[PDB]
Design a binder for this molecule. Structure first.
Ligand SMILES: *[C@@H]1O[C@H](CO[C@@H]2O[C@@H](C)[C@@H](O)[C@@H](O)[C@@H]2O)[C@@H](O[C@@H]2O[C@H](CO)[C@@H](O[C@@H]3O[C@H](CO[C@H]4O[C@H](CO)[C@@H](O)[C@H](O)[C@@H]4O)[C@@H](O)[C@H](O[C@H]4O[C@H](CO)[C@@H](O)[C@H](O)[C@@H]4O)[C@@H]3O)[C@H](O)[C@H]2NC(C)=O)[C@H](O)[C@H]1NC(C)=O
Ligand code: HEM
Ligand SMILES: *[C@@H]1O[C@H](CO)[C@@H](O[C@@H]2O[C@H](CO)[C@@H](O)[C@H](O)[C@H]2NC(C)=O)[C@H](O)[C@H]1NC(C)=O
Ligand SMILES: *[C@@H]1O[C@H](CO)[C@@H](O[C@@H]2O[C@H](CO)[C@@H](O)[C@H](O)[C@H]2NC(C)=O)[C@H](O)[C@H]1NC(C)=O
Ligand code: CA
Ligand code: CL
Ligand code: CL
Lengths: 55, 465, 105
């Protein structure tokens, strides 16, 4: 079950500015929960009743 | 058979039947919903049914950090190397963190003020939103974790997010131990029981079983006798905070919106410090807000928390009062007269016998809370025994207990001795006036109150590299 | 279990080296006394109508509540010597120690 605060991690993954280290840490955290790409992550957010229309 | 809405008695439903002349439930075919606790060994005809503890029994701040690996990671801020716990992304309390929001299918909190659309909080335990006062304590500890991690990052620039998290966690864990054993338990048990059940700590003993005993889950509910029928909020002059300074409890269960939209944790914490607890008295055991109106806003009927306690003891197969008395090495009253002596109350003995027929059958919570309180304590001998025994096992049987050699350095131990719940309140809220002495005793403003500026900060110097 | 550690595990696993589940989450409570069920092994007292406990009718929990626990709220006695914080710490502490799961409906 996707958590509202995890939406803020999507934001960091889409920040072209935020460094490779931070983004790979977050990718790793999402991969641990069975979510392999940003598309998979947005999709889980949508399906758990979050508004993803920003993406 | 859906236990929330059905009154049929089929597994796993054990609904409470309604007595013939009920003051509230006028319909005798109605019931109070109850789900039997999950068995350790489902569907077994060999084993004696036992229940499960979903948390670590240790005093380890698991209600902050979680007790399962996925949840523990979820409560963490994973977007930096700062070792912080996740904070709410949409709401603040005067620039300070709130708990993150949880995503339940069937969220009770949304039911309390439909228009406000404020969900339950995510914490280490699932009950953080049960009452705003509880939420406030959770929010406090989250803040404290973040402050410690921040401070440790200054002290030790080169530590990664894992190290920062772990170290802050270890300190919060120690703080819960100190407040619990130094400040709380002496006021529960009284001096005599404190000496008997919790002698001066020697060392970690690896042969002490640290598990929660089944009975403890029921006996620790003595606390329901302390519950006041209102939530009290106080402004910065410790004056009643407008409007709704005294909110009925039946309007606060799962009311997470109250925290977010009615002015944060500050007025809640002030209410806690500057209001008396309810005294448990032999014909004033528990208030109607929990006995008649429990969770009335989120559920089809108001539950009865005393009754639930008794149902639950039966569900868990707990021995009756006399068996616990004997366990504790206390006299076991056989007659109405002898129960009169033990309770120092013949009227109450008469009433308990009228319900139960023998003192052998009195349910543990009912018998425990009936006993006269020990001098300067808030439990009688039976409960002092169970509670004391359990806390002994929690301390002696914990390898990471704060005073166990090799857990902290001596200087760290000296630094830790200086912590107090008042100090924590100061460090993490807009509150500038807090309770002196013992927070759990001090209850009257202004008489019992001090400026924050008078309290020693926790000195983290001995956590350096 | 590891040999060298520095921090508690989340689950409480490995606190006790010789019996590593002791205090860990999702484990059976310990029994200080043998369990007392209507049938010896499973059914709670109160389950089967007209089945006595040790010679006596089992009283309805709600009957006990009405007759013993009920009082008028306007007669409530403030504890002179304890704050509401004393109550709250207790519930908070309880939530460090034990949660007993129940099935989802
Ligand atoms: C480390 O902790 C160990 C456990 O400590 C208990 O829990 C802590 C938190 C404290 O409350 C502590 O006081 C508790 O004892 C501890 O080991 C324990 O040591 C006691 C005392 O030596 C042992 O008790 C002896 O037990 C035997 C066996 O019978 C027992 O088991 C059956 C079934 O469960 C029961 O029916 C019995 O009542 C017992 O419980 C007895 O033979 C023996 O009694 C006989 O001898 C004494 C003394 O001569 C006479 O007075 C008696 O009448 C008897 O003739 C004791 O009762 C206990 O079993 C043991 N527990 C464990 C888990 O090993 C250890 O000593 C601590 N270490 C340090 C360094 O602190
Ligand atoms: C505002 C305070 C409190 C409640 C609201 C509240 C409610 C409950 C409920 C609903 C249960 C489950 C009832 C059942 O058997 O169906 C419950 C269980 C436990 N309590 Fe309660 N409680 C409030 C407050 C306290 C305080 C102050 C306690 C101790 C000082 C306290 C203890 C407990 C314990 C240990 C349990 C059992 C937890 C478990 O599942 O193991 N509570 N409470
Ligand atoms: C993880 O940590 C960072 C740093 O503390 C948090 O960022 C701050 O968030 C607030 C609320 O959105 C902003 O007003 C600040 O400007 C942020 N400051 C910094 C230092 O970046 C972040 O929100 C945290 N995330 C979680 C999930 O708790
Ligand atoms: C339900 O929640 C709403 C939304 O927060 C509360 O509305 C606020 O109420 C106060 C006092 O009536 C007003 O000063 C605010 O302007 C209100 N805000 C909004 C957005 O309407 C409402 O009071 C709550 N209801 C209950 C049952 O207390
Ligand atoms: Ca714990
Ligand atoms: Cl709850
Ligand atoms: Cl319902």
């Amino acid at each position: 079950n996707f958590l509202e605060h995890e939406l803020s991690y999507i934001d960091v993954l889409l920040d072209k500015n935020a460094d490779q280290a931070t983004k790979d840490n977050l990718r790793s955290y999402f991969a641990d929960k069975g979510l392999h790409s940003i598309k998979d992550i947005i999709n889980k957010a949508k399906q758990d009743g979050f508004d993803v229309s920003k993406y | 058979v859906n236990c929330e809405t059905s009154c049929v008695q089929q597994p796993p439903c054990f609904p409470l039947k309604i007595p013939p002349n009920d003051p509230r439930i006028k319909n005798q075919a109605d019931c109070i919903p109850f789900f039997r606790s999950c068995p350790a060994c489902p569907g077994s005809n060999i084993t004696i049914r036992n229940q499960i503890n979903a948390l670590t029994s240790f005093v380890d701040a698991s209600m902050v950090y979680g007790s399962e690996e996925p949840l523990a990671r979820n409560l963490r801020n994973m977007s930096n190397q700062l070792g912080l716990l996740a904070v709410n992304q949409r709401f603040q309390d005067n620039g300070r963190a709130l708990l993150p929001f949880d995503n339940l299918h069937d969220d009770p909190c949304l039911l309390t003020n439909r228009s406000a659309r404020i969900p339950c909080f995510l914490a280490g335990d699932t009950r953080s939103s049960e009452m705003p006062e509880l939420t406030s304590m959770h929010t406090l500890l989250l803040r404290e974790h973040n402050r410690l991690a921040t401070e440790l990052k200054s002290l030790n620039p080169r530590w990664d997010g894992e190290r920062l998290y772990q170290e802050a966690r270890k300190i919060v864990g120690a703080m819960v131990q100190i407040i619990t054993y130094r400040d709380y338990l002496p006021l529960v048990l009284g001096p005599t029981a404190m000496r008997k059940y919790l002698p001066t700590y020697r060392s970690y003993n690896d042969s002490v079983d640290p598990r929660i005993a089944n009975v403890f889950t029921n006996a620790f509910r003595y606390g329901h006798t302390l519950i006041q029928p209102f939530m009290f909020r106080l402004d910065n002059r410790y004056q009643p905070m407008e409007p709704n300074p005294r909110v009925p409890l039946s309007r606060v269960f799962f009311a997470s919106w109250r925290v977010v939209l009615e002015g944060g944790i500050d007025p809640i914490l002030r209410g806690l410090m500057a209001t008396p607890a309810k005294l448990n008295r032999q014909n004033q055991i528990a208030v109607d807000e929990i006995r008649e109106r429990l969770f009335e806003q989120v559920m089809r009927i108001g539950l009865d928390l005393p009754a639930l306690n008794m149902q639950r003891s039966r569900d868990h197969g707990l021995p009756g009062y006399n068996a616990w008395r004997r366990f504790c090495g206390l006299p076991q009253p056989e007659t109405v007269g002898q129960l009169g002596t033990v309770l120092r109350n013949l009227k109450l003995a008469r009433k308990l016998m009228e319900q139960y027929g023998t003192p052998n059958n009195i349910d543990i919570w009912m018998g425990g809370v009936s006993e006269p309180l020990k001098r300067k304590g808030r439990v009688g001998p039976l409960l002092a025994c169970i509670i004391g025994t359990q806390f002994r096992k929690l301390r002696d049987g914990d390898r990471f207990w704060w005073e166990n050699e090799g857990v902290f350095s001596m200087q760290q131990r000296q630094a830790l001795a200086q912590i107090s719940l008042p100090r924590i309140i100061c460090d993490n809220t807009g509150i500038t006036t807090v309770s002196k002495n013992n927070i759990f005793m001090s209850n009257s403003y202004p008489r019992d109150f001090v400026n924050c500026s008078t309290l020693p900060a926790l000195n983290l110097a001995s956590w350096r590299e | 279990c590891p040999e060298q550690d520095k921090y508690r595990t989340i689950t409480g696993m490995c606190n006790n080296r010789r019996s590593p589940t002791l205090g860990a989450s999702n484990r059976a409570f310990v029994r200080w006394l043998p369990a007392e069920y209507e049938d010896g092994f499973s059914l709670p007292y109160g389950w089967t109508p007209g089945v006595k406990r040790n010679g006596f009718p089992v009283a309805l929990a709600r009957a006990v509540s009405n007759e013993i626990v009920r009082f008028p709220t306007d007669q409530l006695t403030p504890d002179q010597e304890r704050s509401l914080m004393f109550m709250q710490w207790g519930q908070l502490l309880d939530h460090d120690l034990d949660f007993t799961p129940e099935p989802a409906a």
